[PDB]
Structure 1
Amino acid sequence: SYYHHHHHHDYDIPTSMPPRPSSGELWGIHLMPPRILVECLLPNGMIVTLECLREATLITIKHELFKEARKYPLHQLLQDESSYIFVSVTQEAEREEFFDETRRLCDLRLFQPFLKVIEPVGNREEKILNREIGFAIGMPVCEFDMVKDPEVQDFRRNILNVCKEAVDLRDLNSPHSRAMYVYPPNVESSPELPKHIYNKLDKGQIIVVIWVIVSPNNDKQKYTLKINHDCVPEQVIAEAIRKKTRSMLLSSEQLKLCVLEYQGKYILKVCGCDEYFLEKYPLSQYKYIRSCIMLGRMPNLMLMAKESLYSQLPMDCFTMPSYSNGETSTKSLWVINSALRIKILCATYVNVNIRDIDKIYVRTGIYHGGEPLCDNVNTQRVPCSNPRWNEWLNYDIYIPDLPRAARLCLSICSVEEHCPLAWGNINLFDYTDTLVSGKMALNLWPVPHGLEDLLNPIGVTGSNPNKETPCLELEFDWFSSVVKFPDMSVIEEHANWSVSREAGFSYSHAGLSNRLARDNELRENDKEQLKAISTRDPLSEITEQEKDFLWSHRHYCVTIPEILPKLLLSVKWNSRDEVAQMYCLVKDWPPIKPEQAMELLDCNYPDPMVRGFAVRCLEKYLTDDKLSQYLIQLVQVLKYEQYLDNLLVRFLLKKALTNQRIGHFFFWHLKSEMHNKTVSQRFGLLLESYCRACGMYLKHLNRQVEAMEKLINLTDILKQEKKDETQKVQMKFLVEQMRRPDFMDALQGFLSPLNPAHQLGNLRLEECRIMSSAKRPLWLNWENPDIMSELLFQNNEIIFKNGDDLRQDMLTLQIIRIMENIWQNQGLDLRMLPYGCLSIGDCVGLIEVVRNSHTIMQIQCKGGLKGALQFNSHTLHQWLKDKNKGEIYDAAIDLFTRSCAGYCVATFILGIGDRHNSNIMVKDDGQLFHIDFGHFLDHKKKKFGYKRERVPFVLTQDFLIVISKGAQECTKTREFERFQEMCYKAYLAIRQHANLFINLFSMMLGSGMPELQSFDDIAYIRKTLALDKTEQEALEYFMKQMNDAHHGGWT
């Protein structure tokens, strides 16, 4: 009766956590057997299978093998064991000589359990610590040596320029400048203090605490100052010593003379983590301090002897590696007198249902981001079967009009039954500036999730490396000579000509789409329209009228630097006449602010000259602070560079090698995307550079990498073979495994990748556990091994997650963090908690634990009375009161109300996954913050969607009650008037910065996040910020949008 007795005949009942797989410890298997047989191959030709413990060091195995070989024949033909080194084939297929004989049999990544014995060939043992490098990278360095392609090999040789220059800036005024590399000063960009931070002082004073140690260790001494906020480390170091060394036996004169000898022997640590105050900066500028002010804490710094610090840094000692345009006056591009034509030939491997699909063809187009001519296909020949067209396609653009950054985008399709099978793009010029001519073999990529479009030009330039995929080969016209792109020298003349040329035209002519009467005077109404355009965001697409308008006024546009992005998108990249002129404007256009100049490194600006300008903008303005904030966007935006070797890559590489905080994250983001073949080689090459030149940090990174591999294995066993076991049984497995000595070794002494300031010491195992999620995240706990553990945090905990794909979270938390800054530094205190996140792999990562915070759900479980009936709206408030009592209470609501206001506005603007009791968290102190963001820009709107403009944070009663102390009819207090006024002021504050937020999302299109496949994904943020309106409308828009989710409140 329920189903109309309609049977589903197909259906048969027989027949979370998804990103697998990999293997770990031996070829077949995740975890090598605890006792194991290993074939030891000797020089004499004997094999002696040796039973070994899983965990045994190679010294042990060698030592025992040369005992056990005695009992086999030919023992007289062996040397002393000391004249031998183990070698074997690893899972990466390379024969690795095993120099570090302390390494354990499980930790070798052996392919088969066997070991060959040899006297060590390659007399520079030192040199063959590229094993260090390739371990850090995750592919062996020798895998590059064998790459044919000369761009690759040229990258490797030429990038060393950058490395050597950075190493020089380190050992310049060493040891100080070395210490400066390792422990850069962690400070805010501005020294100016917001008015709300200042007002937490006594007209600019802070109580501080300087700690000290004298003998032997184990006794420390407070020296509790009350210095000016804007005084500097040196001044604070003095006052600490002054008060330390005042006495009844010391005159005042005698004191100053003991202070001067003492003062410069010390530098300021932070108690509890490896931060240090190493340059003239207002104390208030250092991030630690400014937190201590906001959190109502008394800074705990340590006076540390410079020589005990300079004890702790060893030399980086940079080594140039083993790896240390010739034709003639070749033909200029502008001499070639023909249109472009491109010979298609044959696809080979096209996988299509011939029953389903009629006929298939190659689509093509020339592009520059958007396209220099009519797109064309070829005829629908050899409908499927063995698809073969031996056509020439003919493109209406003269070969001289091809701009330097020009690229062919092609795609095999099916037939209005139009449908892309594969795709691939090619740079029309090579890295040496040489117009591509002859035969090409291009292996194609498969069409991604969202891309219904036929052709895909934003996708990466180059072939697919996966051999077994549609290889569509082809041929380019050959002009009896290698054609090159004209020099700048040449281009400057042709521009100067086109300029002079432009002056003597008739006015009769100057009435068609350019120049005009204006001349050097212009019009005021014109000048009014130009800054009006300029202020528009990047996604408010410009009309042909405005393009021609902007292009004519290109010379005035130099007065308004910030217009450049708009102007460049007005240039007709097909009229080389135009482009040559734009090359001259850009040559010495005024530099612009980095937040603006980043737009010029997205996909829509692929020209070298433009992107150089953009790097020049950064080189000038962008601080080590602001680089480190925007670093994900800058590493990502490398995917849109044409060649391996370029100015942006040389910028970042140098920053990385100059400042080890950047270096640290610069590694991990590259290493993170290593699995993804669109970037495997590029980023590997680059990581090789970094790793070769970063000094000792390689060895530190190598421990972090070793630790993450151990954790990836552990969870991978737990997720595949210990599924369908009890938490109970699983935990017995986890603790057992963690106690083995190879884990104890590999997981205990290292730096947190979430933040390498924190050390991770011994791991307290009693507090380690598998969380309850199906993905089997590990909750890991380490003892902070600092001298002052106690003063900061005694235990350190971070969550490792084997499923999931953190990089959406990673970005939204990064976005949040920027909104907080935008707000706070513009004087308004909304307290967001951008809890740390870091992806290290293919759906793998680390999430900062926030101690003393609970999901609303937990609040309501712990406040739910007697027999399970209904939860109380007040429990939140009742639970919060129980924590905060007295004058403390009033500030705990202010906090809730401030943090709730910001998290309302950010959430609504970003459209993050719907908020509900199990993903909203409140702390003991009363601060609110969201976790588990899901998909950001309303990516569940692919299913229906359409102008939904959703409210994800919908303040239930629960929230409202707390906001208005305890009133009934909460929506009516002044407590809530204020809250709304926070929300409106914050909503508008982000609206004035929406250029950035667009550009930040624009830079992220590079990554393969399904939430960001193309610019209209990003365009949701326009509606929600309401950028096509006035701000007053936008306010009312927001109020409207806010009103209808709560049904009453907002006017």
Structure 2
Amino acid sequence: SYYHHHHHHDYDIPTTFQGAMGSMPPRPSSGELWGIHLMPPRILVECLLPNGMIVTLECLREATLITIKHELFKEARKYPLHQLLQDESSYIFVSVTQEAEREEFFDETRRLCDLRLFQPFLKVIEPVGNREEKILNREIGFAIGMPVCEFDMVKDPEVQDFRRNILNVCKEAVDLRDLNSPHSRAMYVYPPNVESSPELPKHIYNKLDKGQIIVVIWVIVSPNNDKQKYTLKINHDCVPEQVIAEAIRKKTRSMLLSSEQLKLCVLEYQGKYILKVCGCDEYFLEKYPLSQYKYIRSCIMLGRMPNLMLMAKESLYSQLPMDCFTMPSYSNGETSTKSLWVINSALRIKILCATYVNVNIRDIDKIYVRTGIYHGGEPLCDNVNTQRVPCSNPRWNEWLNYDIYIPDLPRAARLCLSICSVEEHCPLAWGNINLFDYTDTLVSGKMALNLWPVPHGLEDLLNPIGVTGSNPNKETPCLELEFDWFSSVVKFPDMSVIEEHANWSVSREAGFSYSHAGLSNRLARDNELRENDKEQLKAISTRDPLSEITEQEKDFLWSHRHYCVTIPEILPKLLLSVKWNSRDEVAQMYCLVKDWPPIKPEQAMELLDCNYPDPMVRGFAVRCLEKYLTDDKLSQYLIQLVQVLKYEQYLDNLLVRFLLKKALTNQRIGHFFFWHLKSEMHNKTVSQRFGLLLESYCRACGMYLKHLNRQVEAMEKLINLTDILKQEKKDETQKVQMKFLVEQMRRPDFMDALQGFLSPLNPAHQLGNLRLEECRIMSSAKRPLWLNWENPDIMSELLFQNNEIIFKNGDDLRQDMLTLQIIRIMENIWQNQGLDLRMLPYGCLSIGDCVGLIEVVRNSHTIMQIQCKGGLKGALQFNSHTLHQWLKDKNKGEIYDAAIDLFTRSCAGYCVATFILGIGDRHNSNIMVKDDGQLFHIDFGHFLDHKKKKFGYKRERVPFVLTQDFLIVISKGAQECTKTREFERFQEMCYKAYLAIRQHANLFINLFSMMLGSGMPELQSFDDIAYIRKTLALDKTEQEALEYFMKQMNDAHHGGWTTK
């Protein structure tokens, strides 16, 4: 009587799922030889000789091409026509690779497994393409992962025009480098790792003797071995030069040197050295206050005494090799064509036939093409075609009639369409086209458009945030169509022509007369506006991007568009208040933007999202970044910029040219600029775009291409390895798997590829030898590898003797990537505005399709481990105090007081960020505490309450609920923690924290706006972002927000939160 004896007949258990052993889905991608992850340890390879003879060598997987060539010509003696062969030296190996291109293997030190051979065979030939140096485009196409020759045979002129034009940028960067060489070359390679502000927060400053630090300068003599401390006590804001002098002073004071003789010895010795950070490739190369470099300010906060090293400039300038940039092997219109403004007709578009429509005829009645014109928002009434020839061979030969005159199309206009099913309305596929091409030319003719599948979150019919262009996947709904042909290529009008039409349109407003019905959209006030109006405009200015503007407010804004120049930051709102369907209006907005005041980058980044697709706009936006955005602030927001490239109409554009230049000016920016582009290469919305761009970077970046190629190879090894652990070696004991992992890693190709390279998490840190005994597979079902390298620095000891990072094939890292980045920003916001809350945004990097690197924080345990270890023999109930007891066990004396302050600071910050970002429910196995008492969250899962997709609504969840465990520790050790001054303070941190992040809500909204570009199901459209609008309470006043927050925090805890 449990189930009312009701059977489920369909239910079948015998191998019925993704649920059973429910983890790890990222497949598939292939490795060493076609159809197999890891080639056999001994393998037979056919060697095709120039005499036509197939001799077949059994040789080792790990065998070098020098080894294999040598054995081939020893074995080719035993086969006929031996006299027809040259010396082995007059030959090179060639074979067909897995990218389906015939690579000539020039670097014969490479091993048979590392070549990606498709089938195991090699062909012998004399070296064609006499510029061998040039056919190290393989370097580039390994770094990129698709061969350079795959671009060379692309028809599309835009792509080919991109490739040739973008070289402007590459030359200019390379020129900027070799300018004050060797200094500026070192400046490229080793840019100063520096906070944006020289100013110091009051809480940092008080951890000194009214502005003094103790440093420790290190120096060496012979052979290296012994080094000598020289423990200075300098000012916090003195430059590296000064610190270098004082070290030398102390070094070279003597009883045999006078006072003057010392000073004269100082000057000669001084500028022959520069400061290195002990333990990693970081250097202090320009006049910044010592506090400003990030290693110092970390050392101040952590209670550490910096360890710098005196480094000979010439021992450094030794290790910089020359970049030597080479121009590649790949090195208009008929006049009077048109003003688009001559064309005297409406828009109409012919919808011809969809081919590959995959639908149940039994389920669906009828199908039709929906369409519309867009600019982010839509220039006219959206229209469809009739529900003709439903399902089978869907064929309409209609002209759709769009009520917009062709002159009124804006430069950035786009047709967005979608095939639908029938109130049973329901999209099947979708696809968008730019109504102009890259050469400004109106689209006229026939276009075949292969469509994209309807994603998870989108219920709407049409999807105009989606990417412009046809789907690279052929076998998909191809809906072909026809645009109107006007007996001439129609081009978009020149800025010289628009600049005049605007200057006229303004003069025509000056003669329009008195009372005007719908005055709404023009002044009437003239030079003297109302005092009440001029304050209503600054009110609109202050509101966030997601507080949508009303038609009154838009008209209002537009009517005082010339006063809006006094309040530059209004621009985002003004632009959205333009009727883009009116060239009279638009032309004027082009003149406003032309010399509108520069604005701060955090506000000019709003202008590069999908709601601002215009060129003139996004120009101004880049113009802002060129002025203000520092090399620091760029590398914080780099992700949000690379993502935002997706929203540009054409390959060649000012943002792409800005970032590329910066990436080649700064090898740190470059390093992440590479990996973020390389990350998304699997995604066919950007494969082409990002490939092309990555080609440019890789051609221009100098030696770092060789460094990246190594990093790249390390990752591939690890992907291939875990891929086997996750497929063949599933259903084997840890013991069996671990033995497979070590077996593999001991092979020489793995020992080569995984040992001597740079951490992609921070290419400062080198990775030396692998310590395999500390290498192991974690307990997770994804089979993350715990990897451990010997830091090969001179001063490993002084920083960390062992580096270790987790490689995790399986999980889409890029949500964590973001939330951690968001936390990193929230920290800097709080702290630089004086209030110490210590977040630990641990490093995370996605380097592919659910493949990535997470930084291990050493000495930190899950609350669960703290309670597993601290838990009494008789399995009954864990004690709430065991956290607190464990923490005392680490921190004892005056130390204890400080560790609680940290735990109380870190906990307050991690409460507020969590509530605001709506991240996954916190619980004992995803919260961590460090020995020194810093608390921090890991494994965030989803972010903006993405499980509100299932039900949701006004859940406004508290994800970090402070159980007793936490409260006890906050209030030393008392009964009824809820009622102490220790906990009063806590609350006031949380209130001051929440309001800090609430007054920057623009930034955070914007950061999420810009991330819509990536295919995170968490960020599908602006309403996804809108949760943060509610959580911060931006509709209300700050006092109402404070009480809302208190309320929200009170209810989850059930008592604790209401005074002030």
CA deviations on 1:754-793 (whole Å, 9 max, x unpaired) are: 0000000001000000000000000000000000000000
Farther off after superposition, 533-542 or 323-332: 323-332
Report deviation, 1:542: 0.3
In structure 1, distance between residues paired with 2:811 and 2:861:
22
Given that 1:246 and 1:255 are in contact with CA atoms closer than 8 Å, whether structure 2 keeps it comes out as yes
Report deviation, 1:13: 1.1
| Percent identity for Structure 1 against Structure 2 | 100
CA deviations on 1:707-736 (whole Å, 9 max, x unpaired) are: 000000000000000000000000000000
SS state of the match for residue 230, structure 2?
coil
Farther off after superposition, 289-298 or 4-13: 4-13
Report deviation, 1:512: 2.8
CA deviations on 1:629-684 (whole Å, 9 max, x unpaired) are: 00000000000000000000000000000000000000000000000000000000
CA deviations on 1:243-301 (whole Å, 9 max, x unpaired) are: 00000000000000000000000000000000000000000000000000000000000
CA deviations on 1:215-253 (whole Å, 9 max, x unpaired) are: 111010000000000000000000000000000000000
In structure 2, distance between residues paired with 1:628 and 1:456:
31
In structure 1, distance between residues paired with 2:434 and 2:333:
21
CA deviations on 1:935-977 (whole Å, 9 max, x unpaired) are: 0000011110010000000000000000000000000000000
In structure 2, distance between residues paired with 1:703 and 1:515:
62
Report deviation, 1:326: 2.5
Given that 2:414 and 2:432 are in contact with CA atoms closer than 8 Å, whether structure 1 keeps it comes out as yes
Match of 1:478 in 2: 485
Given that 1:89 and 1:111 are in contact with CA atoms closer than 8 Å, whether structure 2 keeps it comes out as yes
Given that 1:40 and 1:47 are in contact with CA atoms closer than 8 Å, whether structure 2 keeps it comes out as yes
In structure 1, distance between residues paired with 2:152 and 2:991:
58
Given that 2:912 and 2:993 are in contact with CA atoms closer than 8 Å, whether structure 1 keeps it comes out as yes
CA deviations on 1:307-335 (whole Å, 9 max, x unpaired) are: 00000000000000000032122111000
Report deviation, 1:510: 6.4
Given that 1:181 and 1:660 are in contact with CA atoms closer than 8 Å, whether structure 2 keeps it comes out as yes
SS state of the match for residue 987, structure 1?
helix
Given that 1:507 and 1:516 are in contact with CA atoms closer than 8 Å, whether structure 2 keeps it comes out as no
Report deviation, 1:77: 0.4
Report deviation, 1:867: 1.1
Given that 1:750 and 1:760 are in contact with CA atoms closer than 8 Å, whether structure 2 keeps it comes out as yes
In structure 2, distance between residues paired with 1:379 and 1:145:
43
SS state of the match for residue 250, structure 2?
helix
Structure 2 residue 553 is matched with structure 1 residue 546: yes
Structure 2 residue 724 is matched with structure 1 residue 724: no
In structure 2, distance between residues paired with 1:794 and 1:346:
66
Distance 1:167 1:945, change over 3 A: same
Given that 2:95 and 2:121 are in contact with CA atoms closer than 8 Å, whether structure 1 keeps it comes out as yes
Distance 1:521 1:950, change over 3 A: same
SS state of the match for residue 211, structure 1?
strand
Report deviation, 1:513: 1.8
CA deviations on 1:46-65 (whole Å, 9 max, x unpaired) are: 00011001100000000000
Match of 2:520 in 1: 513
Report deviation, 1:15: 2.6
Report deviation, 1:515: 2.4
CA deviations on 1:495-528 (whole Å, 9 max, x unpaired) are: 0000000001111226532324310001000001
SS state of the match for residue 106, structure 1?
coil
Given that 1:820 and 1:831 are in contact with CA atoms closer than 8 Å, whether structure 2 keeps it comes out as yes
Match of 2:252 in 1: 245
Structure 2 residue 167 is matched with structure 1 residue 165: no
The runs of 4+ residues in structure 1 deviating greater than 6 Å are none
Match of 1:849 in 2: 856
Report deviation, 1:6: 0.7
SS state of the match for residue 483, structure 1?
coil
Given that 2:279 and 2:798 are in contact with CA atoms closer than 8 Å, whether structure 1 keeps it comes out as yes
Given that 1:341 and 1:395 are in contact with CA atoms closer than 8 Å, whether structure 2 keeps it comes out as yes
Match of 1:24 in 2: 31
In structure 1, distance between residues paired with 2:864 and 2:804:
23
In structure 2, distance between residues paired with 1:411 and 1:325:
35
Which structure 2 segments of 5+ residues have no match?
A: 17-23
In structure 2, distance between residues paired with 1:129 and 1:325:
33
In structure 2, distance between residues paired with 1:85 and 1:904:
62
SS state of the match for residue 222, structure 1?
strand
Given that 1:427 and 1:642 are in contact with CA atoms closer than 8 Å, whether structure 2 keeps it comes out as yes
SS state of the match for residue 351, structure 1?
coil
Match of 1:893 in 2: 900
In structure 1, distance between residues paired with 2:530 and 2:608:
33
Match of 1:40 in 2: 47
Given that 1:213 and 1:220 are in contact with CA atoms closer than 8 Å, whether structure 2 keeps it comes out as yes
Match of 1:977 in 2: 984
In structure 1, distance between residues paired with 2:449 and 2:870:
64
Map residues 834-983 of structure 1 onto 2, 5 A cutoff.
Answer: 834-983=841-990
CA deviations on 1:463-498 (whole Å, 9 max, x unpaired) are: 001010010000000100000000000001000000
1:1009 corresponds, among 1016, 1021, 1035, to 1016
Report deviation, 1:19: 1.1
Match of 1:309 in 2: 316
CA deviations on 1:154-204 (whole Å, 9 max, x unpaired) are: 000000000000000000000000000000000000000000000000000
SS state of the match for residue 954, structure 1?
coil
In structure 2, distance between residues paired with 1:962 and 1:947:
32
In structure 2, distance between residues paired with 1:9 and 1:340:
57
Given that 1:316 and 1:696 are in contact with CA atoms closer than 8 Å, whether structure 2 keeps it comes out as yes
In structure 2, distance between residues paired with 1:5 and 1:384:
42
In structure 2, distance between residues paired with 1:177 and 1:710:
35
Farther off after superposition, 294-303 or 317-326: 317-326
Given that 1:342 and 1:393 are in contact with CA atoms closer than 8 Å, whether structure 2 keeps it comes out as yes
CA deviations on 1:973-1030 (whole Å, 9 max, x unpaired) are: 0000000000000000000000000000000000000000000000000100000000
CA deviations on 1:523-580 (whole Å, 9 max, x unpaired) are: 0000010000100000000000000000000000000000000000000000100000
SS state of the match for residue 940, structure 1?
helix
Map residues 256-405 of structure 1 onto 2, 5 A cutoff.
Answer: 256-405=263-412
In structure 2, distance between residues paired with 1:962 and 1:511:
65
Match of 2:6 in 1: 6
SS state of the match for residue 391, structure 1?
strand
Match of 2:695 in 1: 688
Match of 2:600 in 1: 593
In structure 1, distance between residues paired with 2:533 and 2:28:
61
Given that 1:325 and 1:432 are in contact with CA atoms closer than 8 Å, whether structure 2 keeps it comes out as no
Match of 1:178 in 2: 185
SS state of the match for residue 122, structure 2?
strand
In structure 2, distance between residues paired with 1:187 and 1:908:
31
SS state of the match for residue 220, structure 2?
coil
Structure 2 residue 118 is matched with structure 1 residue 130: no
In structure 2, distance between residues paired with 1:780 and 1:313:
29
CA deviations on 1:425-458 (whole Å, 9 max, x unpaired) are: 0000000000000100110010101111100100
CA deviations on 1:570-601 (whole Å, 9 max, x unpaired) are: 00000100000000000000000000000000
In structure 2, distance between residues paired with 1:817 and 1:951:
21
SS state of the match for residue 426, structure 1?
strand
In structure 2, distance between residues paired with 1:107 and 1:145:
25
SS state of the match for residue 726, structure 2?
helix
Report deviation, 1:138: 0.3
In structure 1, distance between residues paired with 2:187 and 2:105:
35
Given that 2:523 and 2:560 are in contact with CA atoms closer than 8 Å, whether structure 1 keeps it comes out as no
In structure 2, distance between residues paired with 1:147 and 1:1027:
49
TM-score by length of 2: 0.99
Farther off after superposition, 587-596 or 9-18: 9-18
Given that 1:831 and 1:895 are in contact with CA atoms closer than 8 Å, whether structure 2 keeps it comes out as yes
CA deviations on 1:888-941 (whole Å, 9 max, x unpaired) are: 000000000000000000000000000000000000000000000000000011
In structure 2, distance between residues paired with 1:866 and 1:421:
60
Given that 1:510 and 1:516 are in contact with CA atoms closer than 8 Å, whether structure 2 keeps it comes out as no
In structure 2, distance between residues paired with 1:465 and 1:970:
61
SS state of the match for residue 235, structure 2?
coil
Report deviation, 1:405: 0.1
CA deviations on 1:836-887 (whole Å, 9 max, x unpaired) are: 0000000000000000000000000010011111000000000000000000
SS state of the match for residue 681, structure 2?
coil
